[PDB]
Scaffold this active site. Structure first.
Site, PDB file in Angstrom:
ATOM      1  N   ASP A   1       0.844  -1.167   0.000  1.00  0.00           N
ATOM      2  CA  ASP A   1       0.000   0.000   0.000  1.00  0.00           C
ATOM      3  C   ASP A   1       0.886   1.225   0.000  1.00  0.00           C
ATOM      4  OD1 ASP A   1      -2.944   0.941   0.637  1.00  0.00           O
ATOM      5  OD2 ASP A   1      -1.777   2.073   2.088  1.00  0.00           O
TER       6      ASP A   1
ATOM      7  N   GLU B   1       0.136   0.300  -6.032  1.00  0.00           N
ATOM      8  CA  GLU B   1      -0.736   1.173  -6.811  1.00  0.00           C
ATOM      9  C   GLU B   1      -0.128   2.551  -6.947  1.00  0.00           C
ATOM     10  OE1 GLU B   1      -5.627   2.346  -6.626  1.00  0.00           O
ATOM     11  OE2 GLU B   1      -4.656   1.837  -4.754  1.00  0.00           O
TER      12      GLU B   1
HETATM   13  C1  LIG Z   1      -3.513   7.441   0.112  1.00  0.00           C
HETATM   14  C2  LIG Z   1      -3.781   6.994  -1.337  1.00  0.00           C
HETATM   15  O1  LIG Z   1      -3.291   8.100  -2.190  1.00  0.00           O
HETATM   16  C3  LIG Z   1      -3.276   7.863  -3.642  1.00  0.00           C
HETATM   17  O2  LIG Z   1      -4.603   7.390  -4.107  1.00  0.00           O
HETATM   18  C4  LIG Z   1      -5.850   8.104  -3.824  1.00  0.00           C
HETATM   19  C5  LIG Z   1      -6.055   9.258  -4.866  1.00  0.00           C
HETATM   20  O3  LIG Z   1      -5.313  10.388  -4.389  1.00  0.00           O
HETATM   21  C6  LIG Z   1      -7.539   9.729  -5.037  1.00  0.00           C
HETATM   22  O4  LIG Z   1      -7.650  10.724  -6.086  1.00  0.00           O
HETATM   23  C7  LIG Z   1      -8.416   8.509  -5.334  1.00  0.00           C
HETATM   24  O5  LIG Z   1      -9.720   9.032  -5.612  1.00  0.00           O
HETATM   25  O6  LIG Z   1      -8.378   7.616  -4.186  1.00  0.00           O
HETATM   26  C8  LIG Z   1      -7.053   7.047  -3.834  1.00  0.00           C
HETATM   27  C9  LIG Z   1      -7.258   6.489  -2.390  1.00  0.00           C
HETATM   28  O7  LIG Z   1      -7.353   7.550  -1.419  1.00  0.00           O
HETATM   29  C10 LIG Z   1      -2.242   6.743  -3.854  1.00  0.00           C
HETATM   30  O8  LIG Z   1      -1.646   6.533  -5.131  1.00  0.00           O
HETATM   31  C11 LIG Z   1      -2.943   5.474  -3.342  1.00  0.00           C
HETATM   32  O9  LIG Z   1      -2.179   4.332  -3.708  1.00  0.00           O
HETATM   33  C12 LIG Z   1      -3.137   5.599  -1.770  1.00  0.00           C
HETATM   34  N1  LIG Z   1      -3.998   4.442  -1.522  1.00  0.00           N
HETATM   35  C13 LIG Z   1      -4.210   3.790  -0.242  1.00  0.00           C
HETATM   36  C14 LIG Z   1      -3.875   4.571   1.030  1.00  0.00           C
HETATM   37  C15 LIG Z   1      -4.756   4.582   2.127  1.00  0.00           C
HETATM   38  C16 LIG Z   1      -4.053   4.350   3.463  1.00  0.00           C
HETATM   39  O10 LIG Z   1      -4.810   4.857   4.533  1.00  0.00           O
HETATM   40  C17 LIG Z   1      -6.204   4.062   1.955  1.00  0.00           C
HETATM   41  O11 LIG Z   1      -7.063   4.944   2.744  1.00  0.00           O
HETATM   42  C18 LIG Z   1      -7.512   4.435   4.028  1.00  0.00           C
HETATM   43  O12 LIG Z   1      -7.274   5.398   5.096  1.00  0.00           O
HETATM   44  C19 LIG Z   1      -8.279   6.434   5.218  1.00  0.00           C
HETATM   45  C20 LIG Z   1      -7.836   7.490   6.269  1.00  0.00           C
HETATM   46  O13 LIG Z   1      -7.443   6.747   7.409  1.00  0.00           O
HETATM   47  C21 LIG Z   1      -9.625   5.678   5.581  1.00  0.00           C
HETATM   48  O14 LIG Z   1     -10.603   6.497   6.202  1.00  0.00           O
HETATM   49  C22 LIG Z   1     -10.073   5.026   4.221  1.00  0.00           C
HETATM   50  O15 LIG Z   1     -11.335   4.392   4.268  1.00  0.00           O
HETATM   51  C23 LIG Z   1      -9.021   3.943   3.872  1.00  0.00           C
HETATM   52  O16 LIG Z   1      -9.302   3.562   2.516  1.00  0.00           O
HETATM   53  C24 LIG Z   1      -6.667   3.992   0.429  1.00  0.00           C
HETATM   54  O17 LIG Z   1      -7.977   3.408   0.200  1.00  0.00           O
HETATM   55  C25 LIG Z   1      -5.598   3.099  -0.282  1.00  0.00           C
HETATM   56  O18 LIG Z   1      -6.020   2.861  -1.632  1.00  0.00           O
END
Ligand SMILES: C[C@H]1O[C@H](O[C@H]2[C@H](O)[C@@H](O)[C@H](O)O[C@@H]2CO)[C@H](O)[C@@H](O)[C@@H]1N[C@H]1C=C(CO)[C@@H](O[C@H]2O[C@H](CO)[C@@H](O)[C@H](O)[C@H]2O)[C@H](O)[C@H]1O
Ligand code: CA
Ligand code: CA
Length: 686
Positions: free
Chosen positions: A229, A257
């Site tokens: 991640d 990703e």
């Molecule tokens: C943190 C993420 O940043 C980038 O991806 C984003 C992107 O900026 C957005 O435009 C898109 O719409 O969504 C993506 C997910 O936010 C990056 O390249 C991703 O690889 C990265 N993805 C991870 C990271 C986190 C780690 O926490 C996950 O979020 C989780 O944490 C939050 C805050 O604590 C929770 O409330 C969420 O429900 C969790 O999903 C992302 O889902 C994961 O894909």
């Protein structure tokens, strides 16, 4: 063992991955459910625990729900212990149901189960020929406010129960304290905090060694893959040493990703996908597939061009993980959406190159917006939906037909709404025809394929209005009408006589590591493997059979090599390129240079005398270095993976366009550590 065996942890293109949010799949043991404010058994508040666990997955493997579907790999939520806090963000309560708010990477999250339940999950999955991939999020621990230590568990990190430390009063500097990222620069997103998550500091030797000992533990428990991640938010040089640790220990498939916005594909996205030693989730594939099959914002020429672009701009297109939706996007199936759009997108992904991942609930036509709406508990375990049957028919062909697992992609027919592509590997062929237009039949004329003569029956059994393909001499098919929404798959398999390499894994390791070379036509008699011109024979080849060779990497210089196989009769395979032999084990060193003033467009880079620093070639130099967050211009800095335990020579240089300015004076030398990290702080030698 053959290439398709559950024992092959290194390559996954013969598999179909089912991505499971553990909590939203099946509660097979209610005794382990969180209680109180943290739990919602009705799963209507999608930010709380609904109760799903590893006994729920075991039961769905045992009773045939997942094996009936032809799933050979599951991708589960991060298995490690998470914080127990219910956090209220603006009235809405939130828990670690998702597994991303880690607190101890050596223990399991008890909501999912115990260490014995994880072992029973691995043994059950393996006994049913299913590989287990886990999420692993080494970027951060959990929500923390250094100003307010009572918020959540203050980012605290434990090591098998022993507390290493928290975000407030971090005197050991286990974490970064630069503020929160505004995502304005890659540098800004690496060293600052993502949202409020306590950012781990990998330049601290204790964090470095801990995260590497933690992943070795999970490798010892028998996992078969890791999805890392937030790779866009950790230093590339530290990720390269992390990958080297896995690969030089127990190599398993690893992918991450790099997120790209709508059509905004990055070079560094590809750069990292080619350099790091890990594969990426193919965002470009998913984006185009939704634009063409879901939103009708582009057409089949857009899809052809993405499938044509990928074979040449990815070094390992067979390791890229493809998908149509996942946890970060709106579900593909919408409310007013035709189910046939989902069933076509699924048939497309399952017969296309790469490693297909299916998000749980797809086959039950779940709809929902972005997080958390795309993570509802799945409503049903019906084994009779059309989408279940499409996966059930197509997913086995990854194991049985090397053209779908490993072949090239060639558009054989196209127009705005129709594409027919062939997948080809040696003698093995699969042809897929898709008409996305839901009212117009498409008249197919002049289709030529590589199939031998015969009347090929649609592998999908007519379920998506497919048809038999009649192939004459020279692969010419007789004309046919492809139904509105029609999808058909036709195939042919035979033994290859010549070696063909479909995939090699790991793609980066030091001398003496056993790599796995998968393909066809290797023969049963032990033959020869070439790294460049170097021949490896006899006892250095651990195992040889027709679809799989396991061979030890020879003691050759570090650098990029081409692999080639020759069977016992001297017939040689295609060239598998871009294999990186490492000089040895790796450690990440931070290099900091002061007083390097630059002009507009001029940046500072690093090169040196080992392959890891580009062997003195300015075009293979490391950087551009950074200069805003940890240190500021004119001081530049960068975290680089270098061979452990040896003296390297190196120099810095500024580069603007073609002009390389080297610093004067003598070459710099430095003896790297055996493990942990090191910083090198130097000043520009005019
Ligand atoms: C943190 C993420 O940043 C980038 O991806 C984003 C992107 O900026 C957005 O435009 C898109 O719409 O969504 C993506 C997910 O936010 C990056 O390249 C991703 O690889 C990265 N993805 C991870 C990271 C986190 C780690 O926490 C996950 O979020 C989780 O944490 C939050 C805050 O604590 C929770 O409330 C969420 O429900 C969790 O999903 C992302 O889902 C994961 O894909
Ligand atoms: Ca439970
Ligand atoms: Ca970070």
């Amino acid at each position: 063992a053959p290439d398709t065996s559950v024992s092959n942890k290194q390559n996954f293109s013969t598999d179909v991955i089912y991505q499971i949010f553990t909590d939203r799949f099946s509660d097979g043991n209610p005794a382990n459910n969180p209680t109180g404010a943290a739990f919602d058994g009705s799963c209507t508040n999608l930010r709380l625990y609904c109760g799903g666990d590893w006994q729920g997955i075991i039961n769905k493997i045992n009773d045939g729900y997942l094996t009936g579907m032809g799933i050979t790999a599951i991708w589960i939520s991060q298995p490690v212990e998470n914080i127990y806090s219910v956090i209220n963000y603006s009235g809405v309560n939130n828990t670690a149901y998702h597994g991303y708010w880690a607190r101890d990477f050596k223990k399991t999250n008890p909501a999912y189960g115990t260490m014995q339940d994880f072992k029973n999950l691995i043994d059950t999955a393996h006994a049913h020929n299913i590989k287990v991939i886990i999420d692993f999020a080494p970027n951060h621990t959990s929500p923390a406010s250094s100003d307010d230590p009572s918020f959540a568990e203050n980012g605290r990190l434990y090591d098998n129960g022993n507390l290493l430390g928290g975000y407030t009063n971090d005197t050991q500097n286990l974490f970064h304290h630069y503020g929160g990222t505004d995502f304005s620069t890659i540098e800004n997103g690496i060293y600052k905090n993502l949202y409020d998550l306590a950012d781990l500091n990998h330049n601290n030797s204790s964090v470095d060694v801990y995260l590497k000992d933690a992943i070795k533990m999970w490798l010892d428990l028998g996992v078969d893959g890791i999805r890392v991640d937030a790779v866009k938010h950790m230093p590339f040089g530290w990720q390269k040493s992390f990958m080297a640790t896995i690969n030089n220990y127990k190599p398993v498939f690893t992918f991450g990703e790099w997120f790209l916005g709508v059509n905004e594909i990055s070079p560094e996205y590809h750069q990292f996908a080619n350099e790091s030693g890990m594969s990426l989730l193919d965002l470009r594939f998913a984006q185009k597939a939704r634009q063409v099959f879901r939103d009708n914002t582009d057409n089949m020429y857009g899809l052809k061009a993405m499938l044509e672009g990928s074979e040449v701009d990815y070094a390992q297109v067979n390791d890229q993980v493809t998908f149509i939706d996942n946890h970060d996007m709106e579900r593909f199936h919408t409310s007013n959406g035709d189910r046939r759009k989902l069933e076509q997108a699924l048939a497309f992904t399952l017969t296309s190159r790469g490693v297909p991942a299916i998000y749980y609930g797809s086959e039950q036509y779940m709809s929902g917006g972005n997080d958390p709406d795309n993570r509802a508990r799945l409503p049903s375990f019906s084994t009779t939906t059309t989408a279940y049957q499409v996966i059930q028919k197509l997913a086995p062909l990854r194991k049985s037909n090397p053209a779908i697992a490993y072949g090239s992609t060639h558009e054989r027919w196209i127009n705005n709404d129709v594409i027919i592509y062939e997948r080809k590997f040696g003698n093995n062929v699969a042809v897929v025809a898709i008409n996305r237009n839901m009212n117009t039949p498409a008249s197919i004329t002049g289709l030529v394929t590589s199939l031998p003569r015969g009347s090929y029956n649609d592998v999908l059994g007519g379920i998506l209005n497919g048809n038999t393909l009649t192939v004459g001499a020279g692969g010419a098919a007789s004309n046919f009408t492809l139904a509105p929404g029609g999808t058909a798959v036709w195939q042919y398999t035979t033994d290859a006589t010549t070696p063909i390499i479909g995939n090699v894994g790991p793609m980066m390791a030091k001398p003496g590591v056993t790599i796995t070379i998968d393909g066809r036509g290797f023969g049963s008699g032990k033959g020869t493997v070439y790294f460049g011109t170097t021949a490896v024979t006899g006892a250095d080849i651990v195992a040889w059979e027709d679809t799989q060779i396991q061979v030890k990497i020879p003691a050759v210089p570090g650098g990029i090599y081409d692999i080639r196989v020759a069977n016992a009769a001297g017939a040689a395979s295609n060239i598998y390129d871009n294999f990186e032999v490492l000089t040895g084990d790796q450690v990440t060193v931070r290099f900091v240079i002061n007083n390097a003033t630059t002009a507009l467009g001029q940046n500072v880079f690093l090169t040196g005398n080992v392959s890891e620093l580009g062997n003195w070639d300015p075009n293979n130099a490391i950087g551009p270095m950074y200069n805003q967050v940890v240190y500021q211009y004119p001081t530049w800095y960068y975290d680089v993976s270098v061979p452990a335990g040896q003296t390297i020579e190196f120099k810095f240089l500024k580069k603007q366009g073609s002009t390389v300015t080297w610093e004067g004076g003598a070459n710099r030398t430095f003896t790297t550590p055996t493990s942990g990290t090191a910083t090198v702080n130097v000043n520009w030698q005019p």
